[model samples]
Target: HHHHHHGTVIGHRDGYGFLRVDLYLSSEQMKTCIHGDQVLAQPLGVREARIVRVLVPKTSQIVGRYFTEAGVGFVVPDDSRLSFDILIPPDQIMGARMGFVVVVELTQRPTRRTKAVGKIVEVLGDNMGTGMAVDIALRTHEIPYIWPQAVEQQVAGLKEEVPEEAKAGRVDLRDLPLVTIDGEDARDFDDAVYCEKKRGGGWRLWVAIADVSYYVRPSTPLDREARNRGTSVYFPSQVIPMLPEVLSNGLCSLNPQVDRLCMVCEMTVSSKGRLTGYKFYEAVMSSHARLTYTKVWHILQGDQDLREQYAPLVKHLEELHNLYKVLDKAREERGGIEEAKFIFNAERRIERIEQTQRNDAHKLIEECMILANISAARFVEKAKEPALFRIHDKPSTEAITSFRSVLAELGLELPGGNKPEPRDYAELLESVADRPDAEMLQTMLLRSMKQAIYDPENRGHFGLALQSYAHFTSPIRRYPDLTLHRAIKYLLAKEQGHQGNTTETGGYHYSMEEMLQLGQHCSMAERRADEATRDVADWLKCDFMLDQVGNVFKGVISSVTGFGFFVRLDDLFIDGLVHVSSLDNDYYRFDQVGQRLMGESSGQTYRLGDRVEVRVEAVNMDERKIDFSLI
Candidate 1:
């Protein structure tokens, strides 16, 4: 069954390419197209295909380092995935000098007859400036950073403060001591929480999210731009927001002591930490205080100065903390996976990268959000409306088999043969808690899980072990959350006999088909944001290693590849490649199932979690690669 199919073209540095859906294309068939191009292809059987036509060219703009050779200018894309070097005409160099980082606007895309042609429009200097890492990454990923004229015009009319007219017919949460707890550098506060004891014994928790849908109406220019961006791309030093500052940072931001419209999820929790009942409604609220995670943590620890300063909210914070304990304990019994997170210190640039664990305040806010999200999933499901549900499918059989093989090689077993549940993985981790190889086992367990995605159908979430789940907390940044808000508002209005005919009722309608399309796009956008930020982080790490070329460092084997094993240095959290060939005096063969490299004659072995010392051999800034040699 050969037919035409459509997918993004994925090019390799080796000149061959493949469709994202895995249809192979040889070098000849790849000539007419470039990486990231959305194309229609005709299947040629044998799992191969040819480009039928280009539906969309992804390289309207390309970020690369420009150089001149024999009076012909060209750009080598910062992303090596883009195999074609854009050729620049003499007239289109636009004053870009040799070795300058430049952004090129493509004049002609690649074809069998001609290479990709482009003209330099912006030069970012010879070397990386303080914030060039982010600048370079933005263009490479093609994330929308500039505001369109229509969107600009639409947002221009928005007032800095919420008006009285916008607050009518909404529940008033002005007197509630709902406070936002975030990082010290947080500028946009989209969520706030308040918890208190009920008359008998249980607690009532209120989770208020900025009512972004109230301002970003459906199908308007602002709405269109928000949907197109999908979600805000957050970087270490900067953020590309989905909405303009007037909304995301001002009117819609749940800042302290300021009136803002919000969507509130009020829940009743039993003494045992079980969510008994919940309801959602639109409201006008003012945050009593804005607190930082560190400050809250300190207050919880009986810090005199901080506790006095936050006296009004201290008791409430304690109550929330108490609730968090019970909720966290409940979560543990259900099985949860832990992942590493990065901490960044910035001064218009990421100064350092360190692995960070979630503190008490962070976990408190997270548990509240998860409860609210589960309630939202159930609300929408009961209402029988179409919305994007956060779904995580179980791991594939192949992934499970390979993961188990690696564990068995380490004298361990994941338990629950064939189709193991999340609990089985969690039990294995708990059992190996004190072992030296625990981290490696945890990584292997994580590797066996599937990536989560948004889907309209209620497929449930495997990671959180929830029967239903949806993203409803950060509507200001995530489009799926905004869509869910609209769905809930529509249902609310219907129950109130409003028929959702006005914007006040979220005046939105969507079909399952529309939701499906949005789910796919939102999932892709999420991956794109993640990749773009990682690219910048990797570039920064390589730049940071430039001054330490000859230094030796103690590190662990973080991952194993066919060609080499990568090491993550202690305290630095930077990974550099220790190429397999550099294991001098020995011929090492890679063991695929065990994820290790072993010397044939010497009987020496290096596997994940082994501690070793290595000297930094070199750094390639352009390729964002670091090379290390064994000491």
Candidate 2:
């Protein structure tokens, strides 16, 4: 009963597509047909034919859980995007529970009147546990948590001491007054800075980054493991180090009182915030101090009492403060976008919890880092060398067009067309600086921008409005910074005739393709780390709310969805959902153009910037969801 025909695909749904064939075949003749397989059929009658041959097997894997209900076992996929669910038999259940996360392997896929058959291959932890975040993230991204034994062994053998051969032909800044500014609880110190006024007019800014490449040779076991990990992942209270502790925390960490190898970006900055001259070099530097952002900010803001507390570092702190102000003014004049800063704090075993506003210290570090990154990019551009640049593309045309429509609805018009540069956006921000809706406008503007990514091509950064930008700091925490460090070293060596360009026939000394792949990996790993951090923060917030179940607080509307509105407490910055059912009023309609929800008859609107009072209703630790109700 086998038949053959030819057709073209027209549409697809849930990994299965429909082909408009010229002929038809009987159901029994299509018994060998398979999803994702190419088939040929011959005409049986006039305009239809039967599938005669299967050419390709399906390669996509299905992720789901198995359970039995009403004497029938089935596997339901966790992802709603998947349209088909597999039906399992009694023996195929594999002991999966009613409410557990599990991975199932498909043995027979769905067809006419038949569901896909599958068996449970992996039993992730219970549906409600600390491991849920890990399971969900891993499964969604298809990332593995386990490291190969050979990679582990390679990390184990790393020595803490810098090899003499490795340290040859590099500048030594071990006696400089460089200091690391980070959060009080931060462990991995990746960057240290020193600033002083140059003899005549400009300032000399030196940024020393942890020399990770010196320790991790290219293509070695440690390097391979690091590339595989992509970047270090920071969870709630733990860190999954990209490199072994011996390297990330010891050798490559710019720990105070210890001399560590560094790749330094030394730059001369004019009073106008323009980088006059810049140079990169391999160096050995010791941190003069490890300063926290809060302390630095306090001293810079002329806190006399705080200055006396840290008298020994007061002089250096004042110098840093002055440099920060000078650079800050320059950056403003250069039309840099001043992004709103938000900080998160964790609280447990306390009477209250809170998140603090951004202070001068954060601004200071940001300005300095921006200057260093710009300088590094300039140096690479001047040298005409290949390196990974942190590039942020402009928003797509469709997004800009949509944004323009939103602005018109608000009784406003953008000065420029849909294709405005970053400076144009900066000017727009300046115009709205004094308006009550400034925050809302800025948030919307930011939403219309694309995320920054690491790439070999030097696409300018849109947010900073810079022609060239590279990440030269934080090699210890970021893998791309490490790659940049190696690139800089190679370029420096080439200048001194110590080494030639690694560019070989048929391939680059360092393949651009490989670097791009590594960048994608690091970007994904960074996302995982961010998720882990958020998980921890949510847990701490839940623990903090346990005592405030009936307390009332003032909050701002952070987000609006069809199901509910998310309100973030003004003081604590803890966000909770206010379900639509709990509104206790007239019907609410979501106004997509207005970015808010409005009551049908009350003329009450819950907008992004609106402030409201709410009372804590419940906190679900297992689900990591917080609940609140309008007060």
Candidate 3:
């Protein structure tokens, strides 16, 4: 029997769209639906969906670049979700030229015999200009390029000045010398940290995160926009913030010497690095100074000149440094991960791409944030509050078998074929130290692990090796943190005797269903940001290598696909594909289990980590893909 179900259009490529039957559909019912419509779908198979009825028209306007051919104008979309180009009439070109990126409005949709039509409404200048790559990336990823009118107007009414009554019932920590440490390029500071040597045994760490939930109340336009954005998107010189700048960089930012509302996580850690006791609080706090990681690193190292420069805070820095080492030993004892992607510049477009460094100050903030997050998790869990968790599952059975084979190849093996634990992965990481294949082995082990995703349930985080974890350090930026902030506030209002005999729950509008949806949507938004980040850098790298065509370079096989292998150039810090069609000598058959492609005629194979020589052949701007030919 066929049935109608509601679903979101995930993607539309080549005249066919994928409606993810997430809202309804059993483990058994799947079919493919085409582009240009949202429909009631029937499960074509155990894993597909087919159209049953058109429930609604596709309402969102797509973003694309305008093109001209044979006196006809059309829009070539940057969004991969749309399968076909919109046919634009000559009168509606809006002064946009062939290569200009323009936003389109669908004036007329397609029928069985014809394609859709559109009109150019906005022009974004040249596609290859300054900040244009990120502009294109934002639209391609379907992230809102600008705030909604309601959000912008609501933000205009938001003030940065703190009211006296706003501090009522909150911890008064402005008298304490807490400071915010961030990078030199940081625009907004979200967390301020202070630590003290506990009287008898351990260190008391105070982590004050900006109290965004106080200002951006639940169900307001500000909160709605913040949740839509999920988190900030940072490029080399651009920042698409989750909240408007008035709040993100003004009121909610933990700027120096200004009283800011904050949610505080105070925890004590033993000398041996085990976190012992903790408490969460709403607080009014002021950062004593805005310290850069570079300066902090110097002070921690006892640099005589810099110490003299920051003399007033040198002792505090020293204690923080001492505490960090103990905490880090425990962190490595558990397993945790840090992550990054790429960057680009305009005139000096390649300068930022070539440099990166990590230091002790960075480590200190990380260790401290993790501790605070852990404390917040325990607090919320103990309060029996429903909240989203940053969780990672153990490896799957298929992954386990493949990882076991790969490890055995390297003379490493798990105790049994049974599922491996976080420490199991951690121990393997420790064992690979000083070996020639350390980085490669580490990478393979990391690949074997599953991706971490947000879930409402508090599943243990395998990568962090934490039995419990939630984000608490940056409610100003991440939404789940704000959700937990509201939950903690809900709990606090009851404890502080605010939730009286009145029937009101005083909790935020957080239903488990919506939280699950938010989890899924925000996860996609984050992944899209990561991909857009990589694409932006890769687009620049391709632009960088446009002049370096025909230059041969030493490289490594970064990945092997069914199409062919991808080679990462040594000097350029970019990757390009060596398509199977260009492999020339023999037909290549991809062996997915082996993670390689074998030549049919010759005994030749290309695998991950294999070093080779390649020449930059071509770069396609529209597709944002680079091509390389084996030398």
- Identify the leading candidate in terms of lDDT: 1
Which number leads on TM-score?
Answer: 1
Identify the runs in model 3 with alpha carbons over 4 angstroms from their true place.
1-59, 68-70, 107-112, 157-160, 335-348, 433-437, 500-509
Candidate no. 3 TM-score: 0.89
User: What would the TM-score be for candidate 1 when compared with the true structure?
Assistant: 0.95
- Candidate 1, 78: how far from true, in Å? 2.0
- Worst ten-residue run, lDDT, model 3? 25-34
Ten consecutive residues with minimal summed lDDT in candidate 1? 338-347
605 Cα displacement, candidate 1 (Å): 0.9
Steric clash pairs (candidate 2): 4-41, 4-42, 5-40, 5-41, 5-42, 22-47, 23-48, 23-49, 24-48, 24-49
lDDT per residue (tens digit) for residues 403-477 in model 3: 678778777886533866777777776777788657656666778777777788888888888999888888777
In the order shown, the candidates' Cα RMSDs to the true structure are: 2.3, 7.8, 4.0
lDDT of 1 at 124: 89
Indicate whether candidate 2 or candidate 3 has the larger lDDT.
Answer: 3
The reply for model 2, stretches above 4 Å from the true place, is 1-67, 70-144, 163-166, 301-313, 338-353, 401-413, 416-418, 498-508, 515-519, 531-553, 560-566, 572-590, 596-602, 614-631
* Global Cα lDDT for candidate 3: 0.77
Query: What digit string (tens of lDDT, one per residue) describes model 2 on residues 1-631?
Result: 3334455322222343344442333343333343334556556455545555554443244556566778787866654334466777777666778766777777886676777777777777474433465455555444445677877887776666766665566677877888898987678888898888888777888888887877777777777777777777765445667777777778888999887888788888887677888887778888988888987887877788878877877776677677888888877776567221233344223245545567878887888888889888777778776677888898788778777777787786666565787767778888888988877788788888997888778889888888899887877767777777777777766676755544111012356776677666676576656755565556656766877888999988888887778998877768999888888678889987567888898887888767889999998865567899987
430-509, model 1: which lDDT tens digit per residue? 89999988877777777778899999998878888778999999998999999999988888877878754445547466
**Angstrom error at residue 245, model 3:** 1.7
Better candidate by lDDT, 1 or 2: 1
Superposed Cα deviation of residue 242, candidate 2 (Å) = 1.7
lDDT of 2: 0.71
